[PDB]
Amino acid sequence: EKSFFLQPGERLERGIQDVYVLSEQQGLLLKALQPLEEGESEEKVSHQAGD
Amino acid sequence: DTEAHVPDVYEEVLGVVPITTLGPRHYCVILDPMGPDGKNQLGQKRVVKG
């Protein structure tokens, strides 16, 4: 729910798209393009690069 | 050093170089980088990441 100004030099990647919403029957198959996903979310499992 | 440099009479402006930025998932292979001496170590190539 944040609202800011596009600062000089900043730019949106693909703009304001949506939030990712998944139900019990929905998933998000993710590939960690960078390693060390330790504290990224509540899972606390340190995903490596690309697993 | 100086955020607005006046081209000196003793200097010729070859050009302006944009900053080459490496993302968190990125590396570049710099051909011919200087060592600490400030002299171009040609032929070499230094992988830079992080």
Residue B10 sits at φ, ψ, to 5 deg, of -90, 5
CA distances from A7 to A4, A10, B45 (A): 8, 5, 36
Residue A27 in tokens: 């998933």
Q: What is the CA A42 to chain-centroid distance, rounded?
A: 13
Residue B28 CA to residue B8 CA, distance in Å, equals: 33
Q: How far apart are CA A39 and CA A45, in angstroms?
A: 8
| Nearest-CA distance A33 → chain B (Å) | 7
Residues of A in contact with B24 (CB under 8 A): 34
Q: Could you tell me if A31 and A37 are in contact, meaning their C-beta atoms sit under 8 angstroms apart?
A: no
Residue A30 sits at the chain B interface (C-beta within 8 Å): no
Method: cryo-EM
B27 membership: H or E segment, kind and range: strand B27-31
Question: What's at B43, amino acid-wise?
Answer: G
Q: What residues of chain B lie within 8 A of the CB of A49, using their CB?
A: 25
Residue A35 near residue A48, CB atoms below 8 Å: yes
Q: Residue B34 corresponds to which tokens in the numbers above?
A: 């200087």
The residue type of B21 is T
